[PDB]
Amino acid sequence: PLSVAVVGAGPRGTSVLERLCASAPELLAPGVRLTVHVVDPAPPGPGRVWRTAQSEDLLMNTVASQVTLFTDESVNCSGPILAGPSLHEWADGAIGPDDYPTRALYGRYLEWVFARTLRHAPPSVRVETHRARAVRLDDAADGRQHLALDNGRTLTGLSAVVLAQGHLPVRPSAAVLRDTEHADRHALRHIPPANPADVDLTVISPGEPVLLRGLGLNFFDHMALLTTGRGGTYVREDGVLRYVPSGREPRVYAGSRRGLPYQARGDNAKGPYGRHLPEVLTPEAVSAFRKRADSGEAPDFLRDIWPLVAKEVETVYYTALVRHPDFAPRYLSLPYGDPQEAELLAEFGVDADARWDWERVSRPYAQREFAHRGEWRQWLLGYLRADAAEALRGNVDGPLKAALDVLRDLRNELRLVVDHRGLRGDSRRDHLDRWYTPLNAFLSIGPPRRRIEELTALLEAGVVEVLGPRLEVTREDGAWLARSPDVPGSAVRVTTLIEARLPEPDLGQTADALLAHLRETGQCRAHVVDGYTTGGIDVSARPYHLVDREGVAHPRRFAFGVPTEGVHWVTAAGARPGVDSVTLSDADAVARAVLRVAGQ
Ligand SMILES: Cc1cc2nc3c(=O)[nH]c(=O)nc-3n(C[C@H](O)[C@H](O)[C@H](O)COP(=O)(O)OP(=O)(O)OC[C@H]3O[C@@H](n4cnc5c(N)ncnc54)[C@H](O)[C@@H]3O)c2cc1C
Ligand SMILES: NC(=O)c1ccc[n+]([C@@H]2O[C@H](COP(=O)([O-])OP(=O)(O)OC[C@H]3O[C@@H](n4cnc5c(N)ncnc54)[C@H](OP(=O)(O)O)[C@@H]3O)[C@@H](O)[C@H]2O)c1
């Protein structure tokens, strides 16, 4: 009997399964029965990340109305549109449309979408689930696929295999290996990069000095598990929030190179579907860059693309500030940085000190010197109160927060520019990977306003201290010493060091047995751009055929999602409804390429 496999049953593998079911009526000759083998060690639909068993203190950073696993009439794909409830719609009042659902609520949704997909499967499709890890993929002698499972079963005679493996484990770095040995030598707790939901924090005693290294979204997970996750609660009084300790909290210290928590997402004022539509980095501009890349002279991010992005962000900021319909047409007609930008801003009455400054935005303390921890704390509380305030204004009327949400709304235009060798190698390395991606994340992939407010209250209550910029950490006899060179008197010896970040996809250092087998036998390879290696797994153009060390696109092997980071930009994001989501059209294209290779 005809047979294919999907490796991974998270949102992406679940979506491949739903799109297979959708197009199998059209693409399988009548009377043909296809078995789809779905393989995941975690219960299928949510997979590992979204599993319903995890702690309820952990949130999504997407509002509930903007999360789906269903196609809609806006999705440009060849498969049939099969409409279904968004997270919000399904949750039946459990969560508001502009509120952040718990990860377990998204799990309960994903669980239901898996079960529904099975119930609605056409007669031509039989689904077989496997509570196992796939560990080897090989060509059989005839060119069909053998997939070996860790439970001793082997799947043979496979027409196609889809790898939707998502957030894979990575070998500990050199730094993380030293810091873990140090914990072993002096009985300390080292927690290496991980989903915060996957870590055991119960070994951290009340009052323990802990360093959270990292101030992004992993940091806010840990912040919550070590406070509200231990009996802590908040109380709102005359608008302002207050933390009510349980007495079980550690003494939490945090820091990073930048020294700042990620910016609050402006409160959504764009409803479920609305966004800033591109007016500088436009489809027309993106076609011009694709053409230059295909004819072998790819653009430079910093010289060619950044100026278009900065112009959009600055334009939306000043449009929200001036609120005059004549303004934006005149500001858009000017090249980025032209002397007339200033003259026009002056004409519409914008003081030289409300002007935009990428230096203030990324390094808002940089004018300022800190005599001790207390000056740093007073400045930081000022900063976080101003961030919360700005986010309350929302992503339409709030000048700053609408401007920064542009960075979110340009993701698809930027994907189309940089993806599949769209940049010179040296630019991808020095401009995108090592500057823009992290800045972007700081500015536009931060937490809900609520979490900034909470952190503000936790600083006031003394439960959490943020150390300061350029976090230094040293192994010392019996502890780690953490300080900020920019904040005298911030030295503190901790006995728990938590790396508050996810492992970044790295094929080179993968801990997944299956990808390691494929790498070592030359059946996949790191995606390389002009001599820069990304450790994404290399794939072809949609529908993303796996590429081997010889440069051959495998007709029977597809890869889709986080492991392809480098080929694709910001793969760690879900599907949005009503905005021609590329996750859903990618899934449709993969499903039809699989059905086609099976029905010859
Ligand atoms: C902590 C965290 C929070 C996030 N929050 C958000 C958010 O709020 N909003 C958002 O849009 N995105 C969020 N994301 C991004 C996330 O990448 C996507 O939402 C989505 O989970 C990606 O789907 P996926 O199937 O590609 O990957 P995953 O969700 O990682 O699924 C991969 C699945 O494949 C399985 N698998 C891997 N290797 C094998 C193997 N060899 N054999 C069998 N099974 C295997 C795993 O067990 C897992 O179930 C978050 C990610 C993380 C880690
Ligand atoms: N709330 C949620 O839904 C949630 C939770 C977790 C993760 N996620 C998803 O996963 C992605 C990654 O999250 P993340 O927290 O790992 O990344 P992140 O949000 O970018 O936070 C990473 C932090 O680590 C710091 N950092 C990293 N390596 C460091 C080092 N060696 N030394 C010092 N500081 C270091 C970075 O700051 P500096 O660069 O300034 O040092 C930054 O402050 C998100 O973008 C999102 O898609 C979502």
- Pick from 283, 282, 341, 290: which is nearest to 312 by CA? 282
**Between helices 11-27 and 582-598, what is the axis angle to 10°?**
50
What is the amino acid identity at position 17? L
Q: For residue 497, give every residue at least 6 positions away whose Cβ sits within 8 Å of its Cβ, in sequence order, or none.
A: 179, 183, 188, 189, 190, 191, 210, 211, 213, 473, 480
- Pick from 575, 505, 514: which is nearest to 16 by CA? 575
Residue that is written with structure tokens 């709030």 in the block? 398
Cα distance between residue 194 and residue 372, in whole Å? 33
Q: Is 587 in the pocket of ligand 1 (CB under 6 A)?
A: no
- Cα of 391 vs centre of ligand 1, distance in Å, is 28
Atom of ligand 2 nearest to the CA of 167: 10
**Between helices 437-444 and 399-409, what is the axis angle to 10°?**
130
* Ligand with minimal distance to 135 CA: 1
| Vertex 283 angle, CA 278 and 284, to 5° | 115
Q: For the residues of 300-353, what is the DSSP string, one character each?
A: PIIIIIHHHHHHHHHHHHHHHHH--TTHHHHHHTS-TT-HHHHHHHHHTT--TT
Q: Is 217 in the pocket of ligand 2 (CB under 6 A)?
A: yes
| Vertex 350 angle, CA 349 and 352, to 5° | 125
Residue that is written with structure tokens 């950044």 in the block? 306
Tokens of 416: 């189309």
- Cα of 501 vs centre of ligand 2, distance in Å, is 5
Atom of ligand 2 nearest to the CA of 196: 6
Instruction: Find residue 170's DSSP bridge partners.
Output: 510
Residue that is written with structure tokens 């009548």 in the block? 30
Query: For the chain, which domains are there?
Result: 2-170+504-598 (3.50.50.60), 174-262+447-499 (3.50.50.60), 283-444 (no CATH)
Cα(first)–Cα(last) distance of the chain, in Å? 14
Helix (H/G/I), strand (E/B), else coil: 589: helix
Helix (H/G/I), strand (E/B), else coil: 240: strand
Cα distance between residue 286 and residue 300, in whole Å? 13
- Cα of 458 vs centre of ligand 1, distance in Å, is 30
Cα distance between residue 539 and residue 450, in whole Å? 39
Provide the b/e sequence for 83-105 (b: ≥16 CB within 10 Å). Answer: ebbbbbbbbeeebebbbbbbbbb
Q: For residue 505, give every residue at least 6 positions away whose Cβ sits within 8 Å of its Cβ, in sequence order, or none.
A: 168, 170, 535, 536, 562, 563, 564, 565, 566, 571
Whether 217 has a binding-site annotation, put simply, is yes
Atom of ligand 2 nearest to the CA of 441: 20
Cα distance between residue 492 and residue 211, in whole Å? 9
The alpha carbons of the chain give a radius of gyration, in whole angstroms, of 25
- Residues 482/471, Cβ–Cβ less than 8 Å: yes
- Please state, in angstroms and as integers, the Cα–Cα distance from residue 532 to each residue in 62, 141, 233, 549, 565, following that order: 32, 35, 48, 16, 14
Cα distance between residue 581 and residue 72, in whole Å? 9
- Residues 225/201, Cβ–Cβ less than 8 Å: yes
Instruction: Find residue 161's DSSP bridge partners.
Output: 5, 557
- Please state, in angstroms and as integers, the Cα–Cα distance from residue 416 to each residue in 188, 435, 440, 477, 585, following that order: 46, 19, 17, 51, 14
What is the amino acid identity at position 223? M
Q: Is 36 in the pocket of ligand 2 (CB under 6 A)?
A: no
Atom of ligand 1 nearest to the CA of 48: 49
**Between helices 217-225 and 449-461, what is the axis angle to 10°?**
50
Q: Is 164 in the pocket of ligand 1 (CB under 6 A)?
A: yes
Provide the b/e sequence for 514-543 (b: ≥16 CB within 10 Å). Answer: bbbbbbeeebbbbbebeebbbbbbbbbebb
Whether 440 has a binding-site annotation, put simply, is no
Cα distance between residue 218 and residue 465, in whole Å? 16
* Ligand with minimal distance to 10 CA: 1
Tokens of 473: 């950490």
Cα distance between residue 251 and residue 236, in whole Å? 23
Strand 145-149 to 496-499 pairing: unpaired
Cα distance between residue 515 and residue 530, in whole Å? 23
**Between helices 373-392 and 399-409, what is the axis angle to 10°?**
80
- Cα of 119 vs centre of ligand 2, distance in Å, is 38
Provide the b/e sequence for 402-431 (b: ≥16 CB within 10 Å). Answer: bbbbbbbbbbbbbbbbbbbbbbbbebbbeb
- Residues 469/460, Cβ–Cβ less than 8 Å: no
* Other CB atoms within 10 Å distance of the CB of residue 307: 14
Q: Is 59 in the pocket of ligand 2 (CB under 6 A)?
A: yes
- Pick from 438, 436, 415: which is nearest to 564 by CA? 415
- Cα of 83 vs centre of ligand 2, distance in Å, is 34
Reduced 3-state DSSP string for 459-489: HHHCCEEECCCCCEEEEECCEEEEEECCEEE
Cα distance between residue 513 and residue 505, in whole Å? 14
Resolution (A): 2.5
What is the amino acid identity at position 188? L
- Please state, in angstroms and as integers, the Cα–Cα distance from residue 531 to each residue in 422, 426, 451, following that order: 14, 8, 41
* Displacement of CA 291 from its chain's centroid (Å): 28
Residue 226: φ, ψ to 5°? -95, 0
- Please state, in angstroms and as integers, the Cα–Cα distance from residue 558 to each residue in 143, 272, 566, 569, 584, following that order: 15, 31, 16, 18, 15
